[PDB]
Every structure is written in C-alpha cells, then in structure tokens.
Amino acid sequence: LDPGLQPGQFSADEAGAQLFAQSYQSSAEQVLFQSVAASWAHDTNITAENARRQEEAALLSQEFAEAWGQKAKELYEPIWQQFTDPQLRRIIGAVRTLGSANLPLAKRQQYNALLSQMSRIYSTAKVCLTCWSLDPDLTNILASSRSYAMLLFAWEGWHNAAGIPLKPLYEDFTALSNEAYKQDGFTDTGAYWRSWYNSPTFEDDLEHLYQQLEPLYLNLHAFVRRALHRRYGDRYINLRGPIPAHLLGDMWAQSWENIYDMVVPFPDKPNLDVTSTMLQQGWQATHMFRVAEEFFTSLELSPMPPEFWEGSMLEKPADGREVVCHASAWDFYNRKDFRIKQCTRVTMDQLSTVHHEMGHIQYYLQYKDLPVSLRRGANPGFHEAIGDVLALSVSTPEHLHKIGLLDRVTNDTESDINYLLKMALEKIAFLPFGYLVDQWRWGVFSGRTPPSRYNFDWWYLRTKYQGICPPVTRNETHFDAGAKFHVPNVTPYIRYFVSFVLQFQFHEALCKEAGYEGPLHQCDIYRSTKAGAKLRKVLRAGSSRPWQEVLKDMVGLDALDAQPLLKYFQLVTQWLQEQNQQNGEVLGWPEYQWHPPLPDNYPE
Amino acid sequence: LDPGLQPGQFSADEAGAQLFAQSYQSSAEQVLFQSVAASWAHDTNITAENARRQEEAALLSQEFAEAWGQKAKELYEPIWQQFTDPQLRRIIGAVRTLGSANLPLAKRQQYNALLSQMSRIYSTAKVCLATCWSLDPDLTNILASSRSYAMLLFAWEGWHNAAGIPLKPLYEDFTALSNEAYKQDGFTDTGAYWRSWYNSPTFEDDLEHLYQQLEPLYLNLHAFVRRALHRRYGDRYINLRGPIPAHLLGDMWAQSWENIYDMVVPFPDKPNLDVTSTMLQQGWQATHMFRVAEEFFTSLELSPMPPEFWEGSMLEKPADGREVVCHASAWDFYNRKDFRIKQCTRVTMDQLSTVHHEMGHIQYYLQYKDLPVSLRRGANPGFHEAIGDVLALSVSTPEHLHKIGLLDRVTNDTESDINYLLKMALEKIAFLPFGYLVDQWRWGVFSGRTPPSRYNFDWWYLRTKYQGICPPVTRNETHFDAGAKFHVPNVTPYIRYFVSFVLQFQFHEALCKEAGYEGPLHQCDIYRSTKAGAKLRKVLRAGSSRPWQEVLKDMVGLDALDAQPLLKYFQLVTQWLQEQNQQNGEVLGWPEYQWHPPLPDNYPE
C-alpha cells in the first residue's frame, strides 16, 4: 500500500479518534474510487484483463482496510464503544470490521477471482439452438410469449446455462466469505449482513410483516392461477397446486406485471400498460432518463450532473462487447462521478427501473459531502426504496395522462381496480420472493444448507412462499438460485423486501406532506416542493443517524409497518377476495407435490 | 377438589416454601394415582365410558395443579428465583408452572377431550380391504415380512390415510390450546417448555453438533441399504441417487431397519444373528421374554419385578375383542406399589429388545419410588428412555445370545463382527435421523413456523432431508402423516429418543469399564456384573434430585452428551461401509431429491 494511504499516529482517546476518522476518510476516497473505477471498466466491458485489473484494485482495497482496521483496534478497541459522539462510534465500528481483509493474501486472491468468475458466468451465459442472452432475448420471451413450450425452453435453458457452472464456485465463495467475517466476530456472513439493520429482533420483525402481507399474496396468486388455467388448461395448471414457475411473465416469477394483459378484468378500459404508446411515440432510453430526472427536479431535488450523462451506459452496446446488463447505480466516492449502467429497453416496467436507479443517484448526490463511511442509506432498504417511491406517483393514470402516455381515464370503479391489480402484480407478487432469497442464503452461510441441499432448500422456499413449482424436474446438479443475478454477484436481497414495505410508508408520508387528500393510490407528489423537502432530509442524512430515528422523523413511526401498503391496496384486496370466493378458489397450494407434465416431444 | 387435597397456609419466605413444598408433594401422590389408574383403565380397554372417567380424572388433576400452583405464586413468585436451595427452586418452579391448568374450565374440558379422541383414533384405526387389519400386529407384520412392493404400499398408504387424515383437525385445536396454556406460564410456546426439561441454554445447537458427527454414518448405511434394495426391487422402484421409498425398510415409519437385515447381511455364511426364528422354534411366549429380561436385571443385583407387576401388567394383546392402546409403555402409579407394562408383545428379537426398554423404565421407578413425587422422573427424559436399551446392548451380543440358548454357534472373527455391527446399525444408526426430526417438526408447529397449511409439506421436507426417504404415493395437505406416528396424537415428546440413542452408548462404555471388561466395546456383556449394577443403581436412585449433567459426570466422567462412545462402538463397520460404498461407486445422499417411485401397474387391484 502506498505510504500516503497508510495510517498515521493518533492519541488513544475520543479526540484522537476524531482525527483518526478524518485521515481515514481522506485516504479511503482514493481507494474507493480506484476500486469502483476498475469495477466499472469490467462491468461495461467483460474481459480477462479488466477482470485482472478489478482484482488488482480489490487487493489494494483489502490492504487498506487491513492497515486501518488494525490501527483502529490498536488504538480504540477498549474505548470506542463509550465515545460520546454517536456518529464517531458508527465510523470506528465500521473501520474495525475488516471483512475479506481478514483473509490471508492467498485466500484474498482466491476470493477476488471467484467474484470475477461468477460475474462472468452469469452475465455471459447464453441459451443456444444463434444464441439468446438473458437481456433482452430471454427477458422478452418470458414477458410476451404465451407458448408453454417456448416459455419452458427459455426457463430451463437459462437456469441450466447459468446455475450449473456456478455451483462449485459458489461453494468456494461461501466458505471464504464465512472465514473472513468470523474473524470480525460474526457467526457467519449472513449475521454480518443482518447487522446492517441494527435490530435485535430483525428476523422476527420481518416474519411479523410477512404474516400481515401473506393474505394479499394468497388471493392474488389464486386469482392469477385461475387465469392461467383457462389459457393453458388442466394439463398444465393445478387449481389446488403451485403455479409452474415459467408462466408469470418473468424468469424468476418475481413480478407479474407482464401477464397483466391475461388477467386484466376489464380489457375494454384504456390499456394501463403504456408500453405500446411509448413505442408508438418513439421513446428511447435517453427520453426515459430525462423524464425521470424532471420528476426529481420538480421536487427541487438535484438534476443529473454532466458527468452522469457523459459516463453512464444507458443502452446495451451494439459493438458486441459483453456487459453486465443488470441495472445498477454507481457512486465513485469522489463527489463528482455518478453513473447508471442499464441495458434499457423501451417498456413501462423499464421506465420504473429507470426511476429506481435514478433514486440511488439522487441519494449519492444528496450525501456526497458526508464522510465516506456515512455515504450509505439509513439502511440498505432505504436506498432501494427512493426511486420506487417516485415511480408510485409516475404510474398513476393521472400522471401518465400528464406526460402524454394515456388519454385521460374515467375515475370509475373498473379503472381503479384495473390499476390496483396491475400494481399488485408488480408489488404484492414480489413480496414472497423478496423475503425468501436471503432466507435461502442465510441458511447457506449458516451451514444449515450445505451444497448437497442448495436446490432442495431453494425450491422448498420457492414453493413455501411463492407457491410455484419448477416446470421440469430439478436435482442437486442444478443450482437454480445461481440463475438469479444477486446470488453470483453477491448482492444481498432482504433490502428489497424492506424496500417494498418502506416505499408505501414513504409514499403516505410524502402525500400527506404534499397536501393530497384523496385515495392514497391516486396520489401524485409531482411538483410538491414540501414533499421534496421532507425526502431531501432523509437523503442528506446518509447513515449518520439510526434508520429508526430517520424514519420516525419522516413518517411518524420508528419501525417498518405494513399498514400503508395495506391501505394502498385495500380496494383490490377486497375485490380479489370476492372473485376467488365466487370462483370457489382454494387459497394456497395444498397439492404441494404437484409438478406439470412435459410438453409432448419436448424440446422439439 | 376434595378438602383433604387443598393447600393450607405457609410463610411467604424460603423457610415457608420448604414447608409448602413438603405438603404439596404429600397431597400430589393421591392425585397422581387416580389419574394413572383412570388412564390405565382406558388404555387397556378403550370405551366411551373409560374415556369419560379419564377426562374427569384429568380435570381433577387440573383443579389440584391450579390450587397448588396459585398458592406457590401467591407466596413466592417474586422471591423463589432468589432462593438459596436450588432443589427448592426446582420444585417451586415446577409448581408455579400450571400447564393445561391455566386454561379456563371449558377449555380444559376441550383439551382433555381432544387428547382422549386423538388417542382413540390412533389406537382403533384399521385398514380394511368386512375384513380389516390393525396396526399391531397385522400391519406391523406386513411391513416387517412382506417383500411385495404393492402389498407394502397397500399397508403403508392404508395406515397413513386411516390414522392421519381424521387426526388433523383435532391436532390443530390441541396445538392452539396447548400453546395458550403454556404461554401463561411464560413460555413462548409448548415446544419451549418441552425443551426446558434439559436445562441447557444451547440445547438445540448441542443437538445439531451431535447430528453433524453422526450423519456420515447414516449416509453410508443408507447408500449400502439402498443398493441392497435395488438388487431386489429393481431400477424402477429404487433410484440409486434418490430417496428410498418409505415403505421398504421393514417398519411403518422407516425408523428401524432391522427387519431387512436378511437382505443386507454381508456375510450370510456366519451365524444368523436374527434369532426370531429360534425363539419361535423354541416356543417363546411373552411371559418368557419378560422373565428373561427380569433375570438380567437381577443378575446385576437390581430389583426383580414385584408381584403387583405380574398380576397387573398387560403383556399380550387381549383376545377378548376389546380395544387397547398397543404401543408399548411403562407405568408408575405413584403409590410405591403398582408398576406395570402395557405391551401387545409379539415373539420377535426386536420385541425382546422392546421388553428390555420397558423394563428399564420399571427399574427406574422401583429405585426412586421413595423420593418425593416431583423428583420421581429421569435425570432428564432421555435418561429414562436409555436404561433398558443399555442392557439390551449386552443381551444382543452373540456371546450373550449363546448363553441364553438363542444362538448355538459362536464365532469371533472380523466377518461376524461386521454382521453384528451392521445389524446394530440398522437398529441404532438408522433411527438417528428420525429421532432427531420428529420434534423439529413439532417445535415448528408449536412455534407457528409450520401452520396447518404446511403440516405435511414440512413433515416430508424433514423426512427427506434427514432420513432420505420419500412417500411411495403422492401426498397433499389433506394427509397428516405425522399423525400416523403414535407419539404425535398421544402428545409424547420425541427428542428424548435421539438423546437416549447417544446416551446409551456413553452408559454402555462406562458400565463395561466398571465391570472390568477389556475387549472391544461391541462385544461387552455386563451380565452378572454387580459392580456395573451398583453404578447404574446410583443413577436410578437419584431420580431428578440433581441436574442431569452432574449425574452424567458421576457415571461416565463427562458432563455432556458425547457421540464418541457410539462412534467407537461402530468404528469397524463405519470404516467397512465407507470402503464398500466407494468400491461400489455409490453416490452418498439423494441428489435426485424430487424423485418418487411410480405406482404398481395394478394399484390397488
């Protein structure tokens, strides 16, 4: 490590620790930037050399974390928990957590290389027999094909192509990650991930939230299963069993908005999927980002800086260059460079994804002057929620009308139910998946789920929570969890379950602050500077204050609460119950063993 | 509650608590007796009227528990946790725990009736083809001796459907009432109360650490047996990389595999260690089996069975038509006189082991009958379940079988040792995953992790995860396959048996050392060792007067459960099965976890 990056000498007291933290954040800005820059060069251009460079930068980051973590323990390990400055206590506690820097040098290299190789496998995997990529090809098949056999070939092809080669690498990664964080005092890596929420009863609190939300998912599930039965028949749909996992519009069955046109109860009413209109009007990726930006500036939040427009990758490159297409937002920790990398497609759900990613950017811009250790969300779920809150207003029929994507809708009951159903397909359907992914990974990290049960336990959870089943037989050669981006790319997932609850709490708070008075699901905070001010306070706080205090300042409550979500969907929650009762539906999937048969003469 | 049974007055300090505790135990003995008597009358003669009498006896026990429990809390709830005498803290702590007596009268009656009706359903269920088969003996003998895939399937499916399906609504109601009761005692759910009997803050982690050490032995036995079954049933019904169909292992619950020993025995030219056929040839009856078990106990200078045991016990299924609970059990009537076994005894070697298991309970009762009633239990429940099994470890040795005339030829060679250890593994190692999983299931039900909508999903998740078996016909949540196992509807906790199967080898090692035996642990026979008897007697006479960790330390030199004695016992066959599976190219485990067998072509015609 460069001598200028190595830590100096400081007194072993709170005053010296304050100086220590300043010198830490000073040098960390330079180390973080070279790491983020090298990761960016790789993710927008996957090659062996860029992987080599990214691993060089990761090693330097670990050397830096080792030097500064060791110094923090030498000086402050006995005393930092009694410092009077709470923000200093948070900084010092972080620096003394070394993570992968606890590993010997050889295992650091092994750890860094596993990350590079898992990333390459996921983002370069293809389904052949010409070859299809996940984004756009298989994504478009899953969203729009209504051919059981075609959807199956895409689902099986993708899960086999991505998951199988990842499994031996993921086993090695898990072992090294655990070895690293055990030396920080964590029982396993998952315990470190959960520690970010600073809640002794986190897992119980989540379970209690899901208990309040599960009736909503069960009724949506049964309603959608009934529509699928009519399209595909009794041979492929079991009205008392799990839904085949390839039929819900999405490779992971995690959001169901793409089958809206199959389940929309009133197709005579205006089409609330404005994708057709976006294409008819000539929207491109740049228009989508500019429209998202203008929502932020309407709230008197910040526009995207020139560095964002000049450096971002907003479309998949056409030079054949291989990229990580999964959408992501990037902070280079130099207070200047901020970018999105998205293989943007012109659809309504992509417009929502654009808002999601620009929410991260807005966060980055609002806390860019905090010390680096505080340049985080109040917790990770806060970061994933910011853009989704704005998209809730954008999706309203009235707002779509304002931006020319919808000829004004009549404010009738068929239309309110159409809208809340479409929103349920996007938000309620996701809840079980947002909850289960890290339940799976927590069990892998803890050792409850050894490699010999990776797929058994994954499908246990997928059936338990989502009520889906694999449409072809799976065994432990398969690694279907690995076919989801966040697993090989080691991005935690419980943040998205937290986000999907939190965003309705934020929405209710901002709508009240904006002066809105009508139904919560018709609120649009567009151009509310008061609502922007209340959001800006959250964003500028970073992680300087406990998320429970930041939340109470914003919404009046210091905990996650499902009531705003329930109040948002109240009308369609009632409607769905009635429909399922009238159709005599069974809620849930008591024939839990059921799997569909194979199409005749598949794969031909 | 009869005036003579109601609590009087005592001082609200520790010295008064000693007098309270002394008087509580004095009256508790009479309430215990009438309850056990009424349960005996019902279980040996299932009738509507005997069930009513048992429910009225249970209500009286609840009235007693409430009156004395409320008196303990009135006088001591804020102070008994600071008492200087830890044995007093134990008892005041038990009396403050009212259990089902926390329920209001109407719910007490509901609870008692649920227990009675769940017991009746399980023990009177039949599989009909006019002509109907009972679990014991009819279906038990099919599972043990039929090798017809279709006949075994008829018995397995028939039993699980007949017992499980009607139980499910009752079991849901029982679970809710049980939780409501124990939550008023301060437990998060009933399972937390059940686990508290082991007084170990790390109990669940301790069990998982034991199971990690044992699982490789199970995986290798499983792969070896699965190969033997494949050679008999064929590639259609056995998947060499999948779970074993749950009806092919000799036992309705696949929990002991001793009955398929003839298909797995590696060296059949050696003496046949399954002596059932010799017991039948020689005319053994139930009474002989109990007398031979008794004589092992007396050879150790432990107590014979008293006349009251022989006159009162039910040692055979009654031939007078009447319905009984056939599951083997041992009974303390809490009057220091009456002790009985109720078993529908069949003349087999595994039943001889069951006889020893039940007589181990009786011996415990005889040794601690003069302790105060609250301390008349095992150091923990796993101790109680291990006593008879320890003796049966000696009885089953080829040398001991020769002594009692059940094995003419004796041989001491490596092939005979492998045969013996494989037979013992079919009984002891095959059980371990099942002994561990049953209460994982039930803990999840009590905690609410497993709602009624997932009773069977979670049961079979655990059956496959631990035992590596699959149901041979499709199941759904109308089925309640956990309910087709005695201990679930009869509300008998199960982790005690996992504990016991580990503990019994710790006990065996210590008693063999005390007896002066200096050969391989699996050839030890403590028969006629009065030194071993005296060491076991010290455990039995302690009851629950002392923490089990201290009792274990005195007996075996360690204050914790330890898998090493079991591993040492099985070491030779552990290594042999590993080598055999490697040479045969076996896959350890069941990576085709989704696999289920097809149905027979003419099922169930």
Ligand SMILES: *[C@@H]1O[C@H](CO[C@@H]2O[C@@H](C)[C@@H](O)[C@@H](O)[C@@H]2O)[C@@H](O[C@@H]2O[C@H](CO)[C@@H](O[C@@H]3O[C@H](CO)[C@@H](O)[C@H](O)[C@@H]3O)[C@H](O)[C@H]2NC(C)=O)[C@H](O)[C@H]1NC(C)=O
């Ligand atoms: C659409 O129309 C609704 C009213 O109609 C409602 O929705 C239809 C689709 C049908 O299902 C109808 O049966 C149903 O009633 C408008 O909602 C109403 O807005 C007014 C004005 O904002 C609300 O009155 C306010 O209410 C609060 C307390 O709730 C008071 O503090 C205020 O002083 C004020 O009176 C009214 O409550 C509200 N109704 C409901 C059920 O929430 C909605 O504004 C309109 N939206 C659009 C975009 O056209």
Ligand SMILES: *[C@@H]1O[C@H](CO[C@@H]2O[C@@H](C)[C@@H](O)[C@@H](O)[C@@H]2O)[C@@H](O[C@@H]2O[C@H](CO)[C@@H](O[C@@H]3O[C@H](CO)[C@@H](O)[C@H](O)[C@@H]3O)[C@H](O)[C@H]2NC(C)=O)[C@H](O)[C@H]1NC(C)=O
């Ligand atoms: C079955 O046979 C085993 C093995 O017998 C041993 O090996 C054979 C190949 C021959 O060489 C035999 O002569 C030889 O003993 C018996 O196990 C052995 O038992 C003896 C005592 O009977 C043990 O010797 C004692 O060991 C202790 C120390 O452990 C000393 O204090 C004693 O002085 C004495 O030497 C011997 O260790 C033990 N061997 C093993 C490997 O455990 C076994 O007893 C026999 N069983 C029956 C039922 O006949």
Ligand SMILES: Cc1ccc([C@H]2CC[C@@H](C(=O)O)N2C(=O)CNC(=O)[C@@H](S)Cc2ccccc2)cc1
């Ligand atoms: C319209 C919309 C809104 C929100 C989402 C969220 C929720 C579900 C999850 C998923 O699609 O499964 N999801 C993303 O994935 C988005 N994208 C990231 O969350 C990036 S910010 C995560 C990341 C990636 C790489 C490095 C660092 C961070 C999807 C779609």
Ligand SMILES: Cc1ccc([C@H]2CC[C@@H](C(=O)O)N2C(=O)CNC(=O)[C@@H](S)Cc2ccccc2)cc1
């Ligand atoms: C040879 C042998 C040895 C041990 C056993 C044990 C272990 C497995 C378990 C079972 O067979 O599943 N098993 C019993 O069941 C025996 N019998 C009871 O354990 C009675 S003492 C429990 C009880 C019943 C009713 C009221 C109170 C207590 C089986 C076979």
Ligand SMILES: *[C@@H]1O[C@H](CO)[C@@H](O[C@@H]2O[C@H](CO)[C@@H](O)[C@H](O)[C@H]2NC(C)=O)[C@H](O)[C@H]1NC(C)=O
């Ligand atoms: C089984 O239980 C029944 C009661 O449910 C017993 O029948 C009673 O027998 C006693 C004598 O022992 C008579 O005084 C009662 O009038 C009988 N009652 C009824 C309702 O029949 C029966 O004897 C018991 N059988 C055995 C073998 O003990």
Ligand SMILES: *[C@@H]1O[C@H](CO[C@@H]2O[C@@H](C)[C@@H](O)[C@@H](O)[C@@H]2O)[C@@H](O)[C@H](O)[C@H]1NC(C)=O
């Ligand atoms: C895992 O599965 C692979 C793919 O085939 C699937 O499983 C077999 C058993 C059939 O049911 C087939 O229809 C399925 O599509 C197999 O090639 C592979 O051998 C299996 N792995 C193991 C370890 O058995």
Ligand SMILES: *[C@@H]1O[C@H](CO[C@@H]2O[C@@H](C)[C@@H](O)[C@@H](O)[C@@H]2O)[C@@H](O)[C@H](O)[C@H]1NC(C)=O
């Ligand atoms: C549960 O299953 C019962 C019968 O068993 C199953 O029957 C058919 C449908 C096949 O799946 C077969 O392999 C099974 O054994 C049904 O009678 C009952 O309706 C099912 N319960 C529910 C709620 O669907």
Ligand SMILES: *[C@@H]1O[C@H](CO)[C@@H](O)[C@H](O)[C@H]1NC(C)=O
């Ligand atoms: C991609 O990276 C390689 C290094 O592997 C570099 O030579 C090349 O210029 C990069 N391509 C683009 C388009 O930036």
Ligand SMILES: [Cl-]
């Ligand atoms: Cl997270």
Ligand SMILES: [Cl-]
């Ligand atoms: Cl127990």
Ligand SMILES: [Mg+2]
């Ligand atoms: Mg989508």
Ligand SMILES: [Mg+2]
């Ligand atoms: Mg058996």
Ligand SMILES: [Mg+2]
């Ligand atoms: Mg037998």
Ligand SMILES: [Zn+2]
């Ligand atoms: Zn995000």
Ligand SMILES: [Zn+2]
């Ligand atoms: Zn027992």
